[PDB]
Design a binder for this molecule. Sequence first.
Ligand SMILES: Nc1ncnc2c1ncn2[C@@H]1O[C@H](COP(=O)(O)OP(=O)(O)NP(=O)(O)O)[C@@H](O)[C@H]1O
Length: 205
Amino acid sequence: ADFESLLLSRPVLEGLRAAGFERPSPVQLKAIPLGRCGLDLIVQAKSGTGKTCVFSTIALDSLVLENLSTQILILAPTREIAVQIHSVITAIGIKMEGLECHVFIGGTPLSQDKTRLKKCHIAVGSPGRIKQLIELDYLNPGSIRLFILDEADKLLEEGSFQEQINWIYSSLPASKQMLAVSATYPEFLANALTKYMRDPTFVRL
Ligand SMILES: Nc1ncnc2c1ncn2[C@@H]1O[C@H](COP(=O)(O)OP(=O)(O)NP(=O)(O)O)[C@@H](O)[C@H]1O
């Protein structure tokens, strides 16, 4: 009923408290332990349920802070959502000295992203920019063990980023954990996630 019963690391517990997160929401209670367990998760719950906190907490708890390598990749369907994610992670991560979380979106020179990726624990970005950075080997995906799709319905809908995500998924290490979080779970999304998750655990309220 508090974040302690979820067995999170002390830095994450202290960060949550500092950032105003006093008690977990119903979806946070359910999803966080299962995330810590290393399972592939599909978290489907309506807006207002606390889903960004869910994957942000799982992500920060999983990080090897002393290893300055990109261990976590998070994709978002819009520039604004990518930054929203960065804000939550950097708030919850406030007691983790030297945490490096960076946003990769269009409009910044690729040379600048290359430099930033030299010191980056958690990469958050849009699928097109992330694919370009992996193709250039500016983001070497060799240490990524956690791959998160935020607003997965928006990412994988018709006219969106399925082709780019398929490519990125394939570039990553075979051994990794996947999280997909979404307000809805239509057939197109159920279908698309079969490419990435062999037997996912579902989390709903
Ligand atoms: N358990 C909680 N306790 C207090 N505040 C929370 C909690 N969960 C989320 N919040 C607040 O909401 C912000 C955004 O996180 P969150 O609610 O997880 O994402 P969101 O983008 O609103 N997605 P969702 O809530 O699922 O629609 C945080 O920065 C907090 O200010």
